Design a protein around this ligand. Structure first.
Ligand SMILES: Nc1nc2c(ncn2[C@H]2C[C@H](O)[C@@H](COP(=O)(O)OP(=O)(O)OP(=O)(O)O)O2)c(=O)[nH]1
Ligand SMILES: Nc1nc2c(ncn2[C@H]2C[C@H](O)[C@@H](COP(=O)(O)OP(=O)(O)OP(=O)(O)O)O2)c(=O)[nH]1
Ligand SMILES: Nc1nc2c(ncn2[C@H]2C[C@H](O)[C@@H](COP(=O)(O)OP(=O)(O)OP(=O)(O)O)O2)c(=O)[nH]1
Ligand SMILES: [Mg+2]
Ligand SMILES: [Mg+2]
Ligand SMILES: [Mg+2]
Lengths: 470, 470, 234
């Protein structure tokens, strides 16, 4: 029902400049989606992703994954799946594609680009950052108050990383042209994890994928790609499956490396798992891991080195099996994915690696996400985020509504400390409600920060807030 | 006279195991060079590259480029050049290539893999780090002494990161099997930037590219790829050109971002440069930058934002021009590169972007490399490295020659602090001289450390060295 | 008028020089700002200053100098030429409008605006505001100084209010010590019997006390009184 020509649209939102000369051409024999990948890679938020943590602290020299490393791994897995689709399963998947589209250069580049940018706008301090901002907005934007009675403010009471990522990649650049990185329609369409807003009440997607401010942009993307509300781009399923596989496997690897568990602990957990006792993929992975572990034990290795090698081989085998299962599932259900009324929640659940991935997620939650150190760090990050949000709100509230409670010197300094692009977007005259604009400015300010930068700003403003507090 | 079939050899050094069932296959429809890129990406040193610095400190939240970001940018540029070669200039570049080789999947993957791993084995604290090591090896391995009189010890007196990178990817893995990551012959051949040893005296290459311990491995690579001593793989020129372009442009960008200079300063430096006054590439870049800077000045931006965006446009123009020039130069001189007696020093010199790259390097050296803060940090890193090397040599010296000066408790402790794989390699019975083995152990230990890890280890050992020092 | 014009010229030029020296901008940045300024594109004084600066900068670039040294020399020559041009313009304007200045109903706002160096001085002021006055470090220091001043003023007001009106809320030991810490001449003027309102006298005493302080002295006094204010606060 949905044609690949529209889904792989290489046009961009910004109108083409007719004054450009041949000397200003920058493509240099590159496909448009490859240019999108290059734009994402060379963006400042991509580099700042290194300073933002993923699960565990990033300053312990334990080679744990950060946002940048996780994004690169997801991009690599998506690129590999794209190579498989465009070089082996072209006939099965891309049945009707115009000759003007080079699948072998576009599909891998598109998958890599959407994988690399999938977690670009998430708040710092992991998922606890988004949770903390959601709690702060719920407390400071009460639903019973007439100013925030509207459901649109749910965009902040249930703050999502994906909506902020779309806003950042589309509107939050230095130039205020509502075009951002000016990615192709295919990349923007594939980037939308949840094609619905908080105003909508879709039961298929629990979260919302875009803010109220980006509603027109998302409508344009849907119009230029043949999609609609509630319908997810076919490559978004691949990107989500790759993200799930990557985080589930590499978080277990990081847990083993950090000493919170051991390779034998993971093997026993998978073997004793209720759904993994009879799963073929899990059985094959366990058999391969044990076979390699015997040979490794034959050699001379320290216990930590043996654990590391066994974990590495487990990662290799699990990633291979899960990627193969995901590719097979996508190939088998390609017609349903291309259907205009697709209702598949995720690609992994339709594959044979569902049980293994679910067991890995459970192991990561039980061993790593609920670890005492991780919980303490999450609480510290929540305190930092909430304190900084209160301090910034002291200098933001009333700036658009009309009240002058921000005119204190601390308020003016705090407002000046926010990045210039965010303030420029906030001061622009549009149809958004004033309270919505203030809350969006605060969310944009906090979301773009890294852990170290957020902590430093919080400490600095706490030092400068002493007089006003008393 | 060299053939692309040998240069793109996808075989690996490790003998292919015969007792492997189909259930243990992890290729999953991947080309071997793609698996090489995946192995490089998922390796622990690749993740640890984020903690290693390139020019400027990492703790500042200015989004300056680390070793990981620089390697990823180099890999992206090499991948783009490979896509251009395999999709547009296939007839001009690749002739008499076997149908078994899939150029469209191998060439971009090979270039990306060699770009990503090009700086995996460099010592921390930037280039000065390696320099510092050389100084230490010059003092503690005196040339006039009979023990260290042979030229092979020059391998440490002129320590270079490329030889250590080759050793890391070939031997310095946890599993001691002399195969390392088991990369393909094409990747290993393209990785060797300087195809000569310290003992060999060649006027073509300034530095050596491999240690004495890797002489047999390099000979095997040359035998299996058709190369020889002093002959460089054709893709190594592309990788080196991409590395030069990336560092020269992005170091200027980081200098401007850090505030050590401004966009107008760079424009004036390029315009007033003796060789860039009449250079076509430099003139075009300056014209495009000014044309876009006028339009950007039409809008309302802060001076910092204007500088940042103007230099962003400068980057997107200069990188495009330099990449196009490098591709054209490689296409034109392909016969000379394929010759068994190639003498070209670098690809950029043969290109038309030579003057712009030279001017950018001069600007980086004058403004960023010789800045006061960078010099102070380099001195601190040199002090840290030399102190740690002294403390480690206290526990390494005599471990192989036969002396017992290491038997002190501090010596045993610092020997135990070194990673187990390095000690396993050092204790293995081989033909290397004992002094060479000790020096190699120290070099492998120091090179594999990150900045923060090196500082922490130095401080800890200094704390523990108090009793024996007195 | 002459004093105000000299003050304007001095601060506008030397603040730009200090901005360049401190690294917040560069000589080429200032040259581009002046050249691209709307009112300085056709101003004769600005054109002459830019031409002289470029002519001297070429010769300086011929010599061997570090980038910081080249910036410093170019800034010094810009200061020399701009100061000369602005002073000459101010003198000419004062000489031409001397009768209006001596008029009993003079309505001239400033001497620079009547001179030919008006555009250059205005552009220099805009450059100083955009680069130096709104710099992040300057804003943070301004906020710190504001906090220090307001805290010290509250602490001193604790020991001043009511001293002349009649209320005895100052009789706490901290209030008496704070009053004793103020300079003797200010207190002697405040205690003098005159026709000023009591609240006006108290406010004037506080203003005289704070205004005569320096940065280091104000910070030290604020810290000392904060240390001595712990018991009264609780
Ligand atoms: N610190 C911490 N992180 C968690 C926890 N649970 C999940 N995470 C992390 C791991 C994953 O990156 C991610 C998993 O959450 P989701 O799968 O729901 O991600 P998202 O909603 O963005 O899209 P998705 O469901 O993957 O399609 O958050 C937890 O309990 N504690
Ligand atoms: N901190 C610091 N870094 C430098 C300095 N000079 C160069 N670098 C940076 C730039 C490069 O990424 C790298 C050295 O560049 P080179 O081209 O000279 O390296 P190499 O001799 O291996 O030749 P090649 O890269 O193959 O063209 O370190 C310096 O003086 N101080
Ligand atoms: N920290 C800071 N200082 C400023 C700023 N704007 C002006 N200044 C400084 C520079 C000058 O010394 C002086 C400029 O203010 P005025 O020209 O109004 O001085 P004033 O009113 O005393 O008399 P005048 O106008 O010169 O005749 O204050 C600012 O935005 N931040
Ligand atoms: Mg993710
Ligand atoms: Mg490099
Ligand atoms: Mg003055």
């Amino acid at each position: 029902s949905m044609h690949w020509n529209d889904l792989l649209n290489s046009n961009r939102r910004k109108p083409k400049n007719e004054k450009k000369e041949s000397s200003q051409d920058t493509s240099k024999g590159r496909q448009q989606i490859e240019r999108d990948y290059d734009r994402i890679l060379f963006a400042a938020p991509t580099r700042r992703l290194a300073d933002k943590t993923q699960v565990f602290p990033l300053d312990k020299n334990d080679s744990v994954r950060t946002r940048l490393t996780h994004s690169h791994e997801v991009a690599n897995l998506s690129r590999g799946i794209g190579m498989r689709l465009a070089f082996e399963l072209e006939d099965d998947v891309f049945k009707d594609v115009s000759e003007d589209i080079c699948l072998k250069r576009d599909v891998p580049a598109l998958l890599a680009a959407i994988g690399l940018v999938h977690d670009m706008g998430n708040p710092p301090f992991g998922a606890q950052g988004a949770k903390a901002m959601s709690e702060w907005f719920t407390k400071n934007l009460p639903e019973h108050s007439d100013n925030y009675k509207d459901k649109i403010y749910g965009d902040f009471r249930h703050f999502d990383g994906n909506s902020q990522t779309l806003r950042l990649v589309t509107k939050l650049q230095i130039l205020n042209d509502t075009y951002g990185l000016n990615l192709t329609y295919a990349t923007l369409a594939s980037m939308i994890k949840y094609p619905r807003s908080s105003e909508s009440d879709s039961s298929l997607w629990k979260k919302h994928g875009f803010f109220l401010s980006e509603k027109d942009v998302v409508q344009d993307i849907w119009n230029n790609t043949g999609l609609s509300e509630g319908v997810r781009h076919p490559f978004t399923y691949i990107m989500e499956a790759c993200d799930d596989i990557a985080y589930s496997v590499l978080d277990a690897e990081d847990i083993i490396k950090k000493g919170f568990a051991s390779f034998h602990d993971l093997i026993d957990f998978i073997q004793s798992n209720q759904f993994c006792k009879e799963d073929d993929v899990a059985k094959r992975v366990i058999e391969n891991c044990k076979k390699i572990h015997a040979d490794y034990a034959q050699q001379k290795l320290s216990p930590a080195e043996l654990n590391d090698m066994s974990m590495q081989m487990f990662r290799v085998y699990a990633i291979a099996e899960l990627v193969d299962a995901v590719v097979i599932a996508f190939k088998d259900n390609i017609n349903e994915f291309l259907n205009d009324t697709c209702e598949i929640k995720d690609l992994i659940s339709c594959s044979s690696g569902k049980n293994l991935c679910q067991a890995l997620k459970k192991f990561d939650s039980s061993r790593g996400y609920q670890h005492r150190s991780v919980l303490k760090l999450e609480l510290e990050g929540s305190n930092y985020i909430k304190g900084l949000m209160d301090m910034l709100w002291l200098g933001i509230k009333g700036r658009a509504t009309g009240d002058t409670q921000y005119d204190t010197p601390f308020g003016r300094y705090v407002y000046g400390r926010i990045s210039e692009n965010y303030r420029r977007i906030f001061e622009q005259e549009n149809n958004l409600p004033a309270c919505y604009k203030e809350a969006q400015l605060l969310a944009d300010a906090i979301s773009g920060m890294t852990d170290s930068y957020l902590i430093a700003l919080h400490d600095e403003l706490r030092a400068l807030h002493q007089y006003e507090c008393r």
